[PDB]
Symmetry: D2
Subunit: 387 residues, 4 copies
């Protein structure tokens, strides 16, 4: 039961109300679905199932994963469904597609994630009727994506809990963000994102989007320190050291190692192990810590065996706590930047960092890799990759 | 790897804006999660993951499956997530939880579905701003749950295509519906739903109300009143409110573990999962989805259609249900012996686990050895699972 | 010039989300407009202008007063318009229609008010767009009708201000409310509302329903159940849902013409408008508006308070109504003889003309010569009108 | 009783979602109320009543006329109320305030209109509850301000009916619109709007003292390239029709004897007024019978008029009005009209009264006439004589 990633692709990460301001998530998803089939030389008729993670599907219609699969050219014989583990949806969907082939219930799976947070609507329950008084139109992006359902405050407040408990100062979080911007800004000019990015044509004059628009040029430590806190009047999490609201999609083509050998495909890597563990919702940013340990234990690897690490940077506070506890070399963690600079599409972030992990391992010849993210509500997910 | 269903439970199916009119889906889910743990003698601290299918989670908060697990008593160390394959979500989640234990990544899984379509809100994209003119507040239940995203018409229109293609008259669909109502009315009086139903406490402010009976079951469904109804989707069609399933709320789940685990704990499971399958079809005739799904599930299990002792085929529409029983050709006396969704109700996210609950307890109640549960899915898909006692 | 009220009519006052839950205000207005023409023997083609007070017209369309006139049969040559002085709109519209005839710019006026508080929609400004976060859908009835724009609290809080300054206890307000219910229930049983009420046919989906009785009047209002209610505006206050007027729908109007015109047509008018007045007060105690308005009206008419034979003072709240009767000092036995808005209902835009209808028909049945109608107005205003019989 | 206009003032007319995009109507009204008081030397404590026409007050609060009076300094002893006769509201309020003094029920009146069409909200009746299906959020500006309640189509459709019956071609309407822009742009450059306009401070603070709808260099070629805005094969376009605008205007009314006792030189004497209704299909023909009734009530002939202000709701309705009555077009809208200046529904009636009054004093005209059309099939006119 050896499962490999034959190919992977992702769209550029768009800013909130930016290039993808009016593009539904399934429009970004099918472009990625068509890319992983074209990059692997596999026809759409051979896909058995499409598994796309999505957190904000309100208003898009019946099963947006089916719409993305039908629009990419996957025939009606295949099936499609969506799943939601918040920020780990994109990565958990890859593990779920791996289990479909491992149990012998499928041969070729397209798994990933898609998210259009700009298209997230405002909602309100109006069936019972409002007899008298004002009622609130709730932002589904904030309520169903960014607000803890057990304590009522934003994910940024949970990052404040991580910063206060781990004793991470404002200057330590800002320096981590600037380092993420500098690595991401360098990677874009050097063209290290060109392989993983598939261009998306926004048919409006038509506009082709093939570059992450969240990268701001010349991020200075001085401009980072002038920002006001966004969640606590005297807090430490700001707009600079926290991930933003973004749109995008990413996916991967899954098949057995024997199947890839029969088709002459050179896969990006083999999925050797995965894990998901839950933590206290107050400190949801610490999720990747027990998940990465469980994944490495299942793979038989030590922390020193890792050659490349992709840890999602939801917040600068949560990212500092993860790298210090596990103790892995920070020079191999997010070599090309993180979500603070690239963007954070919730449903697609799991597959987004998997794309960056896969293409960078082949680019520099890394043998062992690990991708992990934190999940709102107090959870984590991790996956071990071997080239 | 042999995976068994150690226990199962479901809430009563409530009417649209009825007893559960103001109850969130995760509150119905938490009751079922606690029930399957109590009925199997398994503590909440041993659950590894909770998998709940849900189609309409807008406005309920971050990951309602996590909320249902935390409120049911499952500790924070465990994980939870939701999935969406429309009407087959409740049953696919059970197959997904079965795969978690088969691959050795988990030991005990709570899988099922929950749906509160009464709590489904109206929405509208307003970030760009409406400079001038009227805009529509869209019903998320209709848009994301009941409308085909490729052709724009309701699921009832796909049933009209099935009825015309299979040449099913208005009288044949009404006769199937009346049979479904009468079987459900008999099952309710005989108490055949008491074992599977777990009572839900509607915690109100002017008195608590206990719900332990499906309120959609209509007493004395007559063929004359069935023929008096108007078509609901085509001005000259055949599908009416009587021969079609309704809008409902409810939750259902099952406790999954290996056969060795149940033997170590002295647990007597309700059944072993022998096979499952999911196939896609044309969205125009999505009601024919269960036909190739049942064929692949039986083919994967090594069974023939004649080997089945009990059959649970979800009755999304009377037209779609008649075409399935006619194609496969199994004995209709073993299909939905206690009624179907036409009489009980059709909570989209929870229907897959709902009919699995009725299949499991009825197989135990009458000593059936082999069973099959199957549903159709909007967009042109089907899902099926074969159960052996 | 001498302007008289040739005829008057009003619909039954409907409960909030009751019989008129889905009937637009102009549908109730058209019924009343047709009634005052039939009761006076005046054809619709003779009306020069229709003046209808309305406070909550959002969502009803372009100028609902014009819609009510066109549906009642008033030809397109005539004009129609709406005005808004809150709770005094129905009565101010009559004074405004009288001025149209006084200045010689019109001959026959249909003036009154209409209100459908059940049909008042929720609204929100969405042109700029909500980039991120929740926004509020505002109840237009609460915001534009029942909330003071200067202090932000409900009209019921202004009644609490009146109760504190006049030292009106909960027991006195409850006793005033129970007395209002018993007078209204007695008047309804005796049929004293039949003349003023015109039946309204609720064109529904499963058959037409005729409404000809005020449905807010509850039979057998007890002081014990009144005292068990909780305060509705202050957690430790005195104004409750029982001693305060409710949310209601309805319409009322009158046909105005000169005394010489009515004499030429052989019409016996209901009364002569002798004087009117409107004065403003502090918005904190808006319920005291009728005190300076009634005095200014009596001064303009040359009357003293003792000359009045009948008084119709709108009962917005039990606190404001008790403070008005104590200041002016008129005999309470001649004030609201058939009950008030606490029992009948308070459709804001139409209440001014509603109590004018009750004053006019009660003056004719008992032979009263001098009458006065007055109401309080949100924001700190009052309006009053003096009527003399013919 | 002879009633005069002691003073008049108006704000600059703002574009839809322009300088007044977030300014409530009563904020514009208070500025105008304070202006007419200062220009006449009359204190706010002397005002008896404020009468402001307003058509779209949804969401602004209880009686916006009272809010404008309280903020302008008018004491609580005075009264205030709003009225609604659509487009003729601003001018009818002046006639109503004139009647208050004629009957001896008031001495000093501030009458006019105010409108903030940008602040008009979307609404929907939700008390009964929407059990199932989609419902519409209704634009109160379109529904309660611009849509005929008897035939269901826009006011621009009624102008199409006017154009067909009088046989007014597209070229004639475009030439009328361009002429209106050129007259308004010339008057602005020469400063003929400076006297009537009171500057408004949009609280960086921004001072607005110029009508922002006036476009410099309006060409006939770009006018003819525009598409019809109400009928796919119609003749009314965005260029030959008035727009959606915000603004306020008012006037100070008192008896001629009162002004003489105060040493005030009035802008004019109100000699007559009239309002007549017409068929709602051709509501633009309202000024035709209304102006005749006003002239008949004043004892004047059409040839006696020295200056005319006829609101330009549409180029089609304005051409039909000038042709029927037959007055000299060289004395009609000498400084431009609503096609170039703007058309704030509640304030347009008083807006053209301001333009008529200051232009009559500027050139020494003795007799004037202001008139507008009203949705639903009505018209209003007023005759002014200088003193
Ligand atoms: C930033 C956030 C908190 C919302 O605040 P926001 O108003 O939308 O942020 P904006 O970009 O619109 O404005 C931020 C300001 O800081 C400035 N700024 C932001 N990042 C900066 C940087 N890195 N360097 C310098 N300046 C910066 C922006 O230009 C902007 O300027 P302004 O003061 O004129 O507005 C949003 O990113 C957020 O909600 N993040 C949560 C992500 C999350 O929780 N994901 C869940 C996974 S746990
Ligand atoms: C069919 C549907 C439109 C029904 O609409 P509905 O009008 O709200 O259904 P209701 O029962 O509330 O109203 C139906 C009317 O017929 C009556 N009626 C319905 N079923 C009846 C029956 N079986 N016997 C007798 N009378 C019946 C009802 O009492 C009601 O009375 P009314 O005429 O006074 O209104 C809706 O339930 C539906 O869309 N179902 C399919 C949803 C779906 O897609 N499910 C998943 C399949 S993929
Ligand atoms: C006072 C007010 C807030 C009440 O809100 P409400 O929810 O509609 O009050 P309700 O009538 O629906 O219910 C009140 C309760 O008291 C009871 N009650 C009301 N009046 C009663 C009476 N006269 N005697 C005995 N019991 C009474 C009702 O039955 C109800 O009990 P329930 O809830 O168990 O059924 C509302 O009527 C209001 O806003 N009034 C303002 C009037 C106003 O401002 N007018 C403008 C003039 S300035
Ligand atoms: C006609 C109306 C719909 C305007 O159309 P609109 O949707 O607002 O579109 P716009 O106003 O932004 O103008 C549209 C285009 O015409 C162009 N245009 C407008 N006026 C122009 C002019 N005078 N000369 C040349 N070009 C012009 C604009 O630049 C714009 O070009 P763009 O689309 O590339 O940005 C609106 O102004 C209206 O309804 N007016 C009627 C008001 C009314 O009836 N009041 C009641 C009277 S009784």
């Amino acid at each position: 039961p050896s499962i490999v990633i034959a190919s992977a692709a992702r769209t550029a990460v768009g800013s909130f109300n930016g290039a993808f301001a009016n593009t539904p998530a399934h429009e970004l998803g099918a472009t990625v679905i068509s890319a992983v089939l074209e990059r692997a030389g596999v026809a759409a008729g051979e896909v058995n199932e499409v598994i796309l993670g999505q957190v904000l599907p309100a208003g898009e219609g019946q099963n947006p994963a089916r719409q993305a699969a039908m629009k990419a050219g996957v025939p009606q014989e295949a099936t499609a469904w969506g799943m939601n583990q918040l920020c780990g949806s994109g990565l958990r969907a890859v593990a779920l597609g791996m289990q479909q082939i491992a149990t012998g219930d499928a041969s070729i799976i397209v798994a990933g994630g898609m998210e259009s947070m700009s298209m997230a609507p405002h909602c309100a329950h109006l069936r019972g009727g409002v007899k008298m008084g004002d009622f609130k139109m709730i932002d589904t992006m904030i309520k169903d994506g960014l607000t803890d359902a057990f304590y009522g405050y934003h994910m940024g407040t949970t990052a404040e809990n991580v910063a206060k408990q781990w004793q991470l100062s404002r200057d330590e979080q800002d320096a981590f963000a600037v380092a993420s911007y500098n690595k991401a800004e360098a990677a874009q000019k050097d063209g290290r994102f060109k392989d993983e990015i598939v261009p998306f044509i926004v048919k409006g004059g038509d506009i082709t989007v093939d570059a992450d628009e969240e990268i701001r040029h010349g991020a200075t430590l001085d401009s980072m320190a002038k920002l006001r806190p966004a969640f606590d009047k005297e807090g430490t999490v700001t707009a600079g050291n926290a991930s933003g609201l973004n749109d995008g999609a990413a996916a991967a083509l899954l098949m057995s190692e024997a199947e890839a050998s029969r088709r002459g495909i050179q896969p990006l890597g083999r999925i050797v192990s995965w894990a998901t563990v839950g933590v206290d919702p107050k400190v949801m940013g610490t999720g990747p810590i027990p998940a990465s340990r469980k994944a490495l234990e299942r793979a038989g690897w030590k922390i020193g065996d890792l050659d490349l690490v992709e840890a999602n940077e939801a917040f600068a506070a949560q990212a500092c706590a993860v790298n210090k506890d596990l103790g892995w070399d920070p020079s191999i963690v997010n070599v090309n930047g993180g979500a603070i600079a690239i963007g954070h599409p919730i449903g697609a972030s799991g597959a987004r960092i998997l794309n960056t992990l896969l293409f960078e391992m082949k680019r520099r010849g890394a043998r062992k890799g690990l991708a992990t993210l934190c999940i709102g509500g107090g959870m984590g997910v991790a996956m071990c990759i071997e080239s």
